[PDB]
Structure formats: C-alpha cells, structure tokens
Amino acid sequence: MKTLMVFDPAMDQALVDFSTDVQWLKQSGVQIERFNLAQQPMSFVQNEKVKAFIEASGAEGLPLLLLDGETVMAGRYPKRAELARWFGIPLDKVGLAP
Amino acid sequence: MKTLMVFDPAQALVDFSTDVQWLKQSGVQIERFNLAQQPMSFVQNEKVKAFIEASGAEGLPLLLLDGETVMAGRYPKRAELARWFGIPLDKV
C-alpha cells in the first residue's frame, strides 16, 4: 500500500478538518503517519527531502506531504477528496459524494 | 537573487499575477509554464515529471526556487515571496 508521511509545523479550522479527514482515510485501510517539529524533530533531519525542503522554503513552508517518498503537496493540507485521489479510495468509502 | 519556476495548471491567481509583476520590476527572474502551452516542460524537468506522476496534475501549481520545491498545491502570498527572495521590510 502507499504511505503518506505528513511533516507538520510545530503548530484553526484547516488543522481540525485535516484531522477529521485523516480519520476517514485511515479507516478505509490507508497508511498515514504524521511528524511535527515539536514532538518528532529528528524525523525532519533524517528524511533527505524534508531537510532540503526546510532549507529551501523555510519551516514556514510546512506542511510537506510525501506519498511513497515523493512530494505531493507543500504549504497547505489536502482536502478529503485529494487524499481519496492519492490513495485510489472511492469517495463513498470516506464519507464523500460527487 | 534566487530564480523562480512556476508550473501552472492548464482570486489567488489574480493576486499572484500582480505579485509576479512586482517581483519582475524588482529584477527577479520568474518563468511560468502551463500544460496548455508549454506541456513538454512538464516532462523535461524531472522534478515536475515526478510531481505530476505522484500527485496528479490536480496537484498543481508547483513552485521551484533555484530548482528546489518550495510550494505545491497553491500559490504563495506576497509575504511568502518576500521571505524566499530576501526582500527586506519597508521602514515606518
């Protein structure tokens, strides 16, 4: 299965909504892991792309989202339908309708 | 000065265009590419090619600063651009 790694800022409705959306996606069987600069700081140094991103964009450029190690979004969180697309999950399995 | 490459999809757009003009008048090098007009740029740049494969074209825009990804999925605000290019705060 694909894995989404989410590199969050140290720390609003966007965050609340993203937490809700992660819950729907995980329960559809999907792999999502989160890391933030306050609680998992070494993860941001040990991942080559994350370290490069912080250097180029600044920490202010977070969040950074990697899908199987590949950048898929940077600077905002995905809507639930965007998560569904990345993982190939039907909308009706994550509480969404077209 | 760092250079900016913007890979666009085929009000945020309007504001961004204004900000691009501001940066251009300041001397910043900015190049834009889209799938309707410059689609082969999207396969020739390996970071863009990989991004489209991973995220989908729906994941655009992708912004590269000296060739490094700095934002993907939305456009930057003027204050973010100022951070990237080291544009100092105005006094008073």
Swiss-Prot record, chain A:
GO biological process, one term: negative regulation of DNA-templated transcription
Source organism, top-level taxon: Bacteria
Gene3D superfamilies per UniProt: Glutaredoxin
Pfam families reported in the protein's UniProt record: ArsD
Gene Ontology molecular function: DNA binding
Sorted UniProt keywords: Arsenical resistance, DNA-binding, Plasmid, Repressor, Transcription, Transcription regulation
Function description: Inducer-independent trans-acting repressor of the ars operon.
Protein name, UniProt field: Arsenical resistance operon trans-acting repressor ArsD
